[PDB]
Amino acid sequence: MRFDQYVDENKSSDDFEPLIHDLFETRWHGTGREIWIERVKDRKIPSTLVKPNYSHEELIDMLIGYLADNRYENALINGLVTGDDLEIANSYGFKGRNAVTNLLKSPEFRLVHTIIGTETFLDLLINYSARMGNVYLWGELNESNYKTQCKSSENLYFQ
């Protein structure tokens, strides 16, 4: 569904009218309606990501680590490469796997979590996925995929 609409959809409280009105303003400028959110996986909200009191930036970075049990299937950070490439990263300032944190840390996302709540916020990032134009915001975690894209689940007739 639409990113903007998603906010009003998972809104825990309607009292956030002012927050939604201002938050929705991003639709014009700020990839508000340009983002599509959908459920990529069917899971449940953990009690360890809601009980503890985390901070905005802290929760964002901490949450990423929650679903980051494995990095890469092949050897990673085996060795260091010397060259001008490092200069590029130092000058241009290359970002790591915590790139999503920058977008999530944005004030716009602060309202979302507030409106949808933590349980929905975590679920949205873990259970669901966000699509921004030609790039994935949440970031797909499908690595087990060998050759096939998705698997067809068993059909469920009517009772």
Among 63, 69, 70, 73, smallest CA distance to 127 is for: 63
Contact in structure between 50 and 67 (CB atoms under 8 Å): no
User: How was this structure obtained?
Assistant: NMR
Among 125, 131, 112, smallest CA distance to 9 is for: 112
Contact in structure between 143 and 54 (CB atoms under 8 Å): no
The C-alpha atoms of residue 140 and residue 129 are separated, in whole angstroms, by: 7
Residues 6+ apart with CB under 8 A from 48: none
The phi, psi pair for 38, rounded to 5°, reads -150, 160
User: What is the sign, positive or negative, of the torsion defined by CA atoms of 94, 100, 106, 108?
Assistant: positive
* Cα maximum dimension of the chain: 65
136-142: list long-range contacts, CB under 8 Å, 24+ apart: 137/35, 137/100, 137/103, 138/40, 138/100, 139/100, 140/40, 141/41, 141/67, 142/40
The C-alpha atoms of residue 55 and residue 87 are separated, in whole angstroms, by: 33
Contact in structure between 11 and 115 (CB atoms under 8 Å): yes
Burial of 50 (0-12, 13-18, 19+ CB in 10 A): middle
**Residue 140 DSSP one-character state:** -
Residues 6+ apart with CB under 8 A from 153: none
SS (HEC) of 76-115: CCCCCCCCHHHHHHHHHHCCCCCHHHHHHHCHHHHHHHHH
The C-alpha atoms of residue 68 and residue 116 are separated, in whole angstroms, by: 23
Contact in structure between 26 and 124 (CB atoms under 8 Å): no
- Locate 117 and state its tokens: 């709540």
The C-alpha atoms of residue 87 and residue 153 are separated, in whole angstroms, by: 48
Using DSSP's 3-state secondary structure scheme, residue 118 falls into helix
- The phi-psi region of residue 63 (left if phi > 0; otherwise alpha if psi is between -120 and 50; otherwise beta) is alpha
Residues 6+ apart with CB under 8 A from 35: 2, 3, 130, 131, 132, 137
